[PDB]
Design a protein around this ligand. Sequence first.
Ligand code: HEM
Ligand code: HEM
Ligand SMILES: N=C(Nc1cccc(CNCCc2cccc(F)c2)c1)c1cccs1
Ligand SMILES: N=C(Nc1cccc(CNCCc2cccc(F)c2)c1)c1cccs1
Ligand SMILES: C[C@H](O)[C@H](O)[C@H]1CNc2nc(N)[nH]c(=O)c2N1
Ligand SMILES: C[C@H](O)[C@H](O)[C@H]1CNc2nc(N)[nH]c(=O)c2N1
Ligand SMILES: OC[C@@H](O)[C@@H](O)[C@H](O)[C@H](O)CO
Ligand SMILES: OC[C@@H](O)[C@@H](O)[C@H](O)[C@H](O)CO
Ligand SMILES: OC[C@@H](O)[C@@H](O)[C@H](O)[C@H](O)CO
Ligand SMILES: [Zn+2]
Lengths: 411, 407
Amino acid sequence: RFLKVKNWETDVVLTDTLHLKSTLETGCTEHICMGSIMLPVRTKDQLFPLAKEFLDQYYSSIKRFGSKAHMDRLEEVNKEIESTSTYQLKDTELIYGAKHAWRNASRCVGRIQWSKLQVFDARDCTTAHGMFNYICNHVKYATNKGNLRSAITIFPQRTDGKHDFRVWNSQLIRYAGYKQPDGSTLGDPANVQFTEICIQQGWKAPRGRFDVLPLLLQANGNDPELFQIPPELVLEVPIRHPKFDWFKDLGLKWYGLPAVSNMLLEIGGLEFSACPFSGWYMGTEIGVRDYCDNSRYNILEEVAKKMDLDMRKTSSLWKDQALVEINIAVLYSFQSDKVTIVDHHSATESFIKHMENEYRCRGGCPADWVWIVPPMSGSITPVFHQEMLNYRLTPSFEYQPDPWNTHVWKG
Amino acid sequence: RFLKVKNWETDVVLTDTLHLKSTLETGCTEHICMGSIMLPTKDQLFPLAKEFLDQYYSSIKRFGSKAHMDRLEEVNKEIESTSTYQLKDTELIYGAKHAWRNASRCVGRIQWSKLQVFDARDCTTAHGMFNYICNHVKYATNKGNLRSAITIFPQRTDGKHDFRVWNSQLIRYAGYKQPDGSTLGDPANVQFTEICIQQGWKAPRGRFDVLPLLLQANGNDPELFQIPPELVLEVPIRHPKFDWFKDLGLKWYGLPAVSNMLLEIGGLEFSACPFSGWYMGTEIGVRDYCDNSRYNILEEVAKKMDLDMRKTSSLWKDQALVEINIAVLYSFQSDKVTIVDHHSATESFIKHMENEYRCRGGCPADWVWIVPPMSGSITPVFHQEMLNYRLTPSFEYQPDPWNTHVW
Ligand code: HEM
Ligand code: HEM
Ligand SMILES: N=C(Nc1cccc(CNCCc2cccc(F)c2)c1)c1cccs1
Ligand SMILES: N=C(Nc1cccc(CNCCc2cccc(F)c2)c1)c1cccs1
Ligand SMILES: C[C@H](O)[C@H](O)[C@H]1CNc2nc(N)[nH]c(=O)c2N1
Ligand SMILES: C[C@H](O)[C@H](O)[C@H]1CNc2nc(N)[nH]c(=O)c2N1
Ligand SMILES: OC[C@@H](O)[C@@H](O)[C@H](O)[C@H](O)CO
Ligand SMILES: OC[C@@H](O)[C@@H](O)[C@H](O)[C@H](O)CO
Ligand SMILES: OC[C@@H](O)[C@@H](O)[C@H](O)[C@H](O)CO
Ligand SMILES: [Zn+2]
């Protein structure tokens, strides 16, 4: 079967066949669309078809499908599964699987970059101190003094589910949040619960507005351990505005390296529960979401005050006005400090070219419109006008529950 | 089977049961979400009529009463014999309000119970349609203090005698493809403009020519009518800070009135059912003015603001976008023509979703359409999970009549 998507700005029509390869399910049915819902231990039985399907995809991409190397590899994996109940990926297959999980990430606007990903193989890691060292190395390589390079570090896969590797942090670099007795929050409200867990575990909290959290690392299903990233490895940008000289006095800064550490990477039925990955920011992530969500740093009022906008009525668009100035400031600052960042115009235009290329060479590009459209100026970006099809391909990044909700404490 | 929607800003979780009542399909499957796609006989009729009458009688606390059973029998009788049926005035009104209530893409539904229903089922000719429409325009405009209204023309019979308004909105501007190769006026309406011309309209060929009405009664050939200028309230667009803004020569009309949809009630189909409310400001300032395939004025505005248009990362488009939208709201407000800003409208909609969950068990909502086209995440709907599903009575899309009509 074929499916068409149309761009309503350009009338360009594209044809999807890739959706035929989708296996995992969406949450939607013929009677209900779940497209705006935020959230979407294996047998030998289920494992061999997953491995075969993956290895067939890998062998086709290297133009060796049905070769002797292909056939021998299938047999080698089959034997390993029934003998040891699982299997190990070769290095090339791991690299391919990690890149493809990114290529297949339908909520990712940055996928034009998918084939340029540095893969660090950390499957020989055994302790949390080992994990600390791997993570430091990742951050230093990815940071590259501001010329950010995409990277992923892949700790040992799941075995019985009782020996998981996990990074408890939601991002490798992120700011603490502290709920005060009077009910206000100091620092980042998104991270209060995790900050509380760190303190409980022994972290000496500085209790300021931008304290970089310590790493909380779990190796081999053991209790997690606390480490501090060396400050010299944490690149940060003070935020200032090109015209508004009072902007600096808001005391804002943000870190340069976005590094997601709480997702699960699934490759050929194997589950990599610790797989921190990093790229670079699109400006709106910081200027719109981190700074301006009511439940995050919530700076809109203070900024509009300093801009002396008319705040008596929403219809003066004071929020919209302040929003734009803050976002200009974020891009200005990163650019001035030579730290990689992309604006939402550049990013969405690049995504449309990526998507079209993918339709032509791959037969499709699964994409989640709700997530691809930026959180400001939606319709003056080309993605707003682009119909998209959302489906799930493997290899993939998947959500997993926060580990404090599942961990069996050893004590 | 019982479904939860979470607001990620406030943590409020609501439980949806209303979706189990859904009849029509979504376009989605368990393998593919089509959430962002723009357009996804007598035997068929009695179940649809029964389902409708059941909800109607339930709504007036008379479910399973003799009045209920009697009407079911009566309509049954009437379909058996006539192959269709007629709604009582009360049922028609209820059904129209509920088609609005059920419109998953409509952010303004807090208003749904306040809809003036004009029954034009006695209408027979295009001149008659013109008269009803003028009366609707004048009633709804109410000198700037806009009132929601729908005018309902006769229902489909054998489908060869359709009433249709060929216009996509009652009031809209013409578009003219030019020797130049550029488009003068509104590029969305080029095709319709030409049809009007080719039917004999004498076009002024300006930037903001109010289209004539192209009205089709009883499956006959459509006829042209000019809406009395005095009934078309228009707003000149100026900015409260930029004195130069007025020199752009921008205006818009006060009355948004959709005329190309099909109203489905209890299986009956009302193919001409023009309906009107009032604007959310972004519709004009973001979409009408700034879409690339529309008036596309971002470049000229940015220029008058002397912004650095060298780099996308200066956010010159974004800055100009906000100013254009400030001007739209200020101009409508200054002239006392009802308008709602996107902050106000989306705040209302969250309150309405909460009412509907509390009083009806749910509220179908299409997040892709509900979130405004600017400043998405600073409005509360951005953070609100929504379930989309199709309830009847409903408004439905239908093919443009010129593709279908046999002249
Ligand atoms: C190279 C620069 C990149 C940019 C600018 C970028 C941009 C983004 C942004 C803006 C989002 C949405 C984030 C949010 O609102 O929470 C996102 C989602 C995502 N991207 Fe990227 N991306 C990049 C690289 C990467 C890399 C290197 C990977 C993994 C190898 C990745 C995988 C993802 C995934 C899995 C999501 C979805 C997260 C979820 O569902 O919660 N991206 N991308
Ligand atoms: C009273 C003020 C109202 C406001 C502010 C309002 C707001 C809106 C907006 C902004 C849209 C999106 C339109 C677009 O982007 O093209 C919309 C969609 C819609 N509204 Fe309303 N609405 C109002 C009243 C009404 C009324 C009176 C009806 C019907 C009786 C109605 C039925 C619809 C329908 C059916 C759609 C979806 C059209 C489609 O799917 O293409 N609304 N509403
Ligand atoms: N630019 C980036 N941003 C990014 C990419 C993927 C994921 C994320 C973080 N997503 C947060 C999702 C989330 C979590 C908790 C609550 C919530 F509302 C939303 C951020 C990158 C991070 C890593 C590589 S690129
Ligand atoms: N404020 C209004 N706006 C509005 C409400 C419903 C529908 C519309 C017009 N929608 C046009 C959607 C559309 C269709 C086909 C192609 C396209 F690009 C865009 C506008 C109202 C119109 C009537 C009552 S409220
Ligand atoms: C409820 C809704 O799905 C939720 O707010 C989504 C909307 N779109 C998003 N898009 C991105 N990129 N990131 C997000 O966190 C969200 N949040
Ligand atoms: C392709 C995409 O579905 C399309 O551009 C939609 C997105 N959301 C929208 N939302 C509204 N309210 N109106 C629209 O016309 C659209 N267009
Ligand atoms: O404070 C705890 C949160 O940071 C955490 O629960 C995240 O929201 C979660 O890891 C998803 O990002
Ligand atoms: O916490 C809700 C959002 O504000 C948050 O997830 C941001 O979008 C994220 O930090 C962007 O990178
Ligand atoms: O033509 C595509 C859109 O610009 C258009 O449908 C507007 O969104 C509409 O006129 C707003 O009322
Ligand atoms: Zn769906």
